[PDB]
Amino acid sequence: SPIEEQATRLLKEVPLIDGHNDFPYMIRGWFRNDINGQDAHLYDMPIGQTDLQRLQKGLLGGQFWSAFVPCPKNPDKEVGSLEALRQTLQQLDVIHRLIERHPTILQFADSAASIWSSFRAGRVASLIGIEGLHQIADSVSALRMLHRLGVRYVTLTHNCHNAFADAATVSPELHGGLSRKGERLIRELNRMGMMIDLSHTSHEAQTQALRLSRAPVIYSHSSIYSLRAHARNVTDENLHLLHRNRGVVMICFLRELLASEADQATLAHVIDHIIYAGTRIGYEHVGIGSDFDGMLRGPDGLHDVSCYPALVAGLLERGVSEEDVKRVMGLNVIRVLEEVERVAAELQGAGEECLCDELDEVWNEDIKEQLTRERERVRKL
Amino acid sequence: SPIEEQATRLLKEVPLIDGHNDFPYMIRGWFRNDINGQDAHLYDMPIGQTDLQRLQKGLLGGQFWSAFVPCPKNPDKEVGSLEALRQTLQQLDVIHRLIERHPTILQFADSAASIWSSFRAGRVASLIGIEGLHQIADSVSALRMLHRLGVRYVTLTHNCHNAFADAATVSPELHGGLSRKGERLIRELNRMGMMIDLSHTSHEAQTQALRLSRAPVIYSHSSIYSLRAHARNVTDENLHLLHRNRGVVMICFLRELLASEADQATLAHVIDHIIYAGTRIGYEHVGIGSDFDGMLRGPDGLHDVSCYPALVAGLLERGVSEEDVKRVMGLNVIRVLEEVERVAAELQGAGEECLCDELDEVWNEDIKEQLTRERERVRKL
Ligand SMILES: [Cl-]
Ligand SMILES: [Cl-]
Ligand SMILES: [Cl-]
Ligand SMILES: [Cl-]
Ligand SMILES: [Fe+3]
Ligand SMILES: [Fe+3]
Ligand SMILES: [Fe+3]
Ligand SMILES: [Fe+3]
């Protein structure tokens, strides 16, 4: 078919960059992050919607791999919070080892230039994001070290309220959007060059974050509220504020977010959602955010990572222009990452002060007096 | 004086690379890692043996900055261990922010080439080490992420026993050297290219580590047992095994480790210790490991980081050759770091398997059966 030829050409010209895939958590579930002598299975998985053969088959140009850990359940809240931090480092570790063990297929990327260079070399540009601020254990220092390990977006919440923001699917509300900590964290995320992700957050938290942020944000895996009413989907109000923000809504393949009866969800519904957003806030503010391996089953025609050429062909069949399809595929999320990094560079260049953690006093006045007395003795020498 | 001229020339020709300085912990003690608008104080500190003016004055070529946190004290052992991990990320964060805020003085280095390029540019080569395996919270994944954040050596213990090895100053003994975990960790440290540090560890743990390690190790801040008997100092047995290992003993300025009465300790004693080691196991296996800011007061003539030219002049005055003084200054620790990284590259190139953490099962058999059934349904499509 001419359109299947056309779709194949587009996937080779520009990278399709998917906003969210939980394949690293499947590796934790199935292998317990032990991939030594498991290439046969990593290429052909006995579970899930992602493996390295099907990843090549679907012609995916890049991927934000999710370093998700569950919301802490432990009765003792300090343990659970600190446990989530250790589990995050385990998930970042297995993502890096997955990329390093398969350098013909996957190449690490943390920027627009690194995405392109990976795509020129014929590899999947492998970026990283964390799904929730519960993962940092209330530590902005830890968050900067996660950025240093290659994390390029942070979902403000998952399916639990944290000290910074409200999740969508939990009632009652705790902060009613963002807390004062949350607001102050928006400035720090903009300063460090961390891309803000508004998936899983409440409608009020989205509205506040979109007004406050000095850099463009994303929805790594969310759909449209008007087509299908759900707490996880984006309202027409927040879609317009996303336009002012210059952000991108990366459309989700979650069946619950596409249709009222989950088993009726299809590829055509995903295309309806992309076109709705593209019509109302322009095709330069829409993306693709599958959420593959964050679900058991996908929509009809989007069952796994091999199905991306059908999505590209489907968009072209509906009269979306080549140039707009290239934007939806990946050019838009590349622009947001580039603008997030430009805003961070110009804020850092202006000498903006970084957010610091609240630390305990390690020394009492006796120890501090010994230290000052010792210093003055050295000054006399 | 001609020898002071000579000492100044050597410090400009090759970098003096100090093995251990706890200045990042002083920043935690004094500022609580909040250095915003504190340059006046960072250049001229009201406490401690290190600031940025005196660092320039002493002509130090490089420094392994310590990312030490205390041994966990909390009754609940899971909390204390996980707390130490979060505090480690806080200390790595402030070290990176210290370097990034003062790029004229400090430049980050993690290799031989990066040390030299920093030194050619006229900056202190800023490397990182952690003082104890309590800091990783029993997580090899976390340890690899610490390596990724720029940590290039790990002291196996501080002043507490951990799951991997015995500290020197704690009795009774727990493992009697290294545990089985400890032995297995030696292979992983060699594979990843992490430099093993044997300061603070027991004599038996040193003997076992020196025999087991496939790469050269260091003592980041230890002295000589024969000159001054102390659990922290290196025995003649372990000095010989360090020679076979191709490692380096970086001599400590701790007064307790140099003399029986601490107040009698001097610069001359530090030179006695360097010459003792250099005479018996060669000058290519000796270094300088001040431990500045790990003590209240230093030896006479080595009161702070400005005193390194007196140490270089003192070594030349005692008939140690220029070439051997250059070795003791930094060429030796550069060689060990280069050999550690060469061993890691050749082990990684041979496809050696990495050590993995023991993880909990996240899925039961019901969830795993749903996943395999779902996969087979997709195979039929
Ligand atoms: Cl609208
Ligand atoms: Cl704390
Ligand atoms: Cl000997
Ligand atoms: Cl675990
Ligand atoms: Fe997810
Ligand atoms: Fe999700
Ligand atoms: Fe120390
Ligand atoms: Fe120490």
Which domains does chain A show, CATH number per domain?
1-381 (3.20.20.140)
The active-site residue, picked from A96, A221, A273, A285, is: A221
- Considering CB atoms only, which of B37, B149, B296 is closest to A148? B149
Q: Which residue has the tokens 């509300």?
A: A173
Q: Is B247 helix (H, G, I), strand (E, B) or coil?
A: coil
Contact A28 B362 (CB under 8 A): yes
B12 sits in which H/E element: helix B2-13
As a whole number of angstroms, the distance between CA A29 and CA A23 comes to: 10
Q: Is position B158 annotated in a ligand binding site?
A: yes
Experimentally, the structure was elucidated by X-ray
Q: Are A151 and A194 in contact (CB under 8 A)?
A: yes
* C-alpha to C-alpha distance for A294 and A292, rounded to whole angstroms: 5
CB atoms within 10 A of CB A176: 12
Token pair 């620790």: residue: B333
Q: Are B132 and B200 in contact (CB under 8 A)?
A: yes
Candidates B102, B134, B200, B273; catalytic one: B200
Return the residue in B375, B377, B379 with the most chain A beta carbons within 10 A, the one to mutate for interface testing.
B375
B248-251/B218-219 β-pairing: parallel
The continuous run of DSSP H or E covering A130 comes out as strand A124-131
- Substitution target in A22, A110, A352, A357 with the highest count of B β-carbons within 10 Å is A357
Q: CA A153, CA B266: separation in Å to the nearest integer? A: 53
Rounded to whole angstroms, the Cα distance separating B297 from B48 reads: 9
Instruction: Identify which of B46, B141, B353 has the shortest CB distance to residue A375.
Output: B46
Count CB neighbours of A380 within 10 A.
5
Contact between chains at B93 and A137 (C-beta distance less than 8 A): no
Those of residues 68-87 in A touching chain B at CB distance below 8 A are: 76, 78-79, 82-83, 85-86
Distance separating alpha carbons of residues A69 and A297, to the nearest angstrom: 20
B79 contact residues in A (CB cutoff 8 A): 76, 78-79, 82
Amino acid at B307: C
DSSP, collapsed to helix, strand or coil, labels residue B56 as: helix
Q: Which of residues 145-174 of A touch B (CB under 8 A)?
A: 145, 148-149
Q: Does the annotation count B22 as an active-site position?
A: yes
- Resolution (angstroms) equals 2.3
What SS3 class is residue B2?
helix
Q: Which residue has the tokens 């030219």?
A: B309
Query: In whole angstroms, what is the distance from residue B123 CA to residue B327 CA?
Result: 20
Q: How far is the CA of A159 from the centre of ligand 6 (A)?
A: 8
Q: Which two tokens stand for residue A276?
A: 């709705």
For residue A137, the tally of other CB atoms under 10 A from its CB is 24
Full DSSP string of B139-154: -HHHHHHHHHTTEEEE
Those residues with Cβ within 8 angstroms of residue A204's Cβ, 6 or more apart along the chain or in another chain: A166, A173, A176, A177
Considering only CB atoms, A90 lies closest to which of B97, B357, B368, namely B357
Q: Which residues contact A5 (CB under 8 A, 6 or more apart)?
A: none
Q: Do B29 and A148 count as a contact with CB atoms less than 8 A apart?
A: no
- The 10 Å CB-count burial string (b at 16+, else e) for B206-215 is bbbbbebbeb
> At B145, which amino acid appears?
M
Query: Cis peptide before A172, with omega less than 30 degrees from 0?
Result: yes
Q: How far apart are CA B342 and CA A302, in angstroms?
A: 46
Output b/e per residue, B233-260; b: 16+ Cβ within 10 A. bbeeebbebbbebbbbbbbbbbbbbbee
Phi, psi dihedral angles at B125 (to 5 degrees): -65, 110
Burial of A321 per CB tally in 10 Å (0-12, 13-18, 19+): exposed
Amino acid at site A151: V
Cα-based distances in Å from B91 to A92, B136, B146, B223: 20, 13, 11, 26
Burial class (CB in 10 A: 0-12, 13-18, 19+), B29: buried
* Positions of E strands within A277-351: 286-288
Element (H, E) at B28: helix B23-30
Does B34 contact A356 at a Cβ distance shorter than 8 Å?
Answer: yes
Q: Using CB atoms, which residue from A29, A359, A367 is nearest to B363? A: A29
Distance (angstroms) between ligand 7 centre and the Cα of A24 equals 36
A352 reaches B (C-beta below 8 A): no
Asked if B135 contacts B109 with a C-beta cutoff of 8 angstroms, the reply is no
Q: How far apart are CA A208 and CA A184, in angstroms?
A: 12
Does the CA dihedral A372-A373-A376-A377 come out positive or negative?
negative
Amino acid identity for residue B121 in this structure? A
